[PDB]
């Protein structure tokens, strides 16, 4: 039930922007309460945002969100914190959570 689907990992050396994605089954609606976290490098999960607002950090992040199966995706530089930092969650049905990013080689 309402399983979330992610993509493969994104590997980049330069401080280029990156985009990630999340897909799921469903019907259209006015409700928009999907969100994102990061696994911070030596911390637990941390939330960046939910509805298109930001937690206590610089808004270098993008809330590319839509209705139905929200075409959820996003950062401008990736100059910090690359440790699989985009987990998708859907607080609509069963509070399902699932999740990616790296700077290496």
């Amino acid at each position: 039930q309402v399983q979330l689907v992610q993509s493969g990992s994104e590997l980049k050396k330069p401080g280029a922007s990156v985009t990630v994605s999340c897909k799921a089954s469903g019907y259209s609606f006015p409700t928009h309460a999907m969100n994102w976290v990061r696994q911070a490098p030596g911390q637990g999960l941390e939330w960046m945002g939910w509805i298109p607002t930001y937690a206590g950090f610089t808004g270098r992040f993008v809330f590319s969100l839509d209705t139905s199966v929200s075409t959820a995706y996003q950062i401008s530089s990736l100059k910090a914190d690359d440790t699989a930092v985009y987990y998708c969650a859907r607080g609509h049905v069963l509070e399902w959570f699932q999740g990616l990013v790296t700077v290496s080689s």
Partner: protein
């Protein structure tokens, strides 16, 4: 005060119950403006599911083995039994206290 938790590591026998407590500064808030308390659980770099606990009531989610003395700012989860290696790290979440915050038991032995 800061969603800090008891450093339980390996002190659980494979056939025994276990419990983990954490501390908040207050008790009646959530992200949607209602009362809530949340828990997550995993050992490996996999995806934990989110379990909802109220300020006056018990839950079930994907897993069934939950109880817990969420009695005050000191909120305790009761693990009815740890089935040997079926272990994971536990985190507390509060809508108004970083949403997810904590230190994470570790293993069975």
């Amino acid at each position: 005060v800061v969603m800090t938790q008891s450093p339980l590591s390996l002190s659980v026998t494979p056939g025994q119950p276990a419990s983990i407590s954490c501390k908040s500064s207050q008790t009646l808030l959530h992200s949607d403006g209602q009362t809530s308390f949340y828990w997550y659980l995993q050992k490996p770099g996999q995806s934990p599911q989110l379990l909802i606990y109220d300020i006056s009531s018990r839950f079930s989610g994907v897993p069934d083995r939950f109880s817990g003395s969420g009695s005050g700012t000191d909120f305790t989860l009761k693990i009815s039994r740890v089935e040997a290696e079926d272990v994971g790290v536990y985190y507390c979440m509060q809508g108004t206290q970083p949403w997810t915050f904590g230190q994470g038991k570790v293993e069975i032995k």
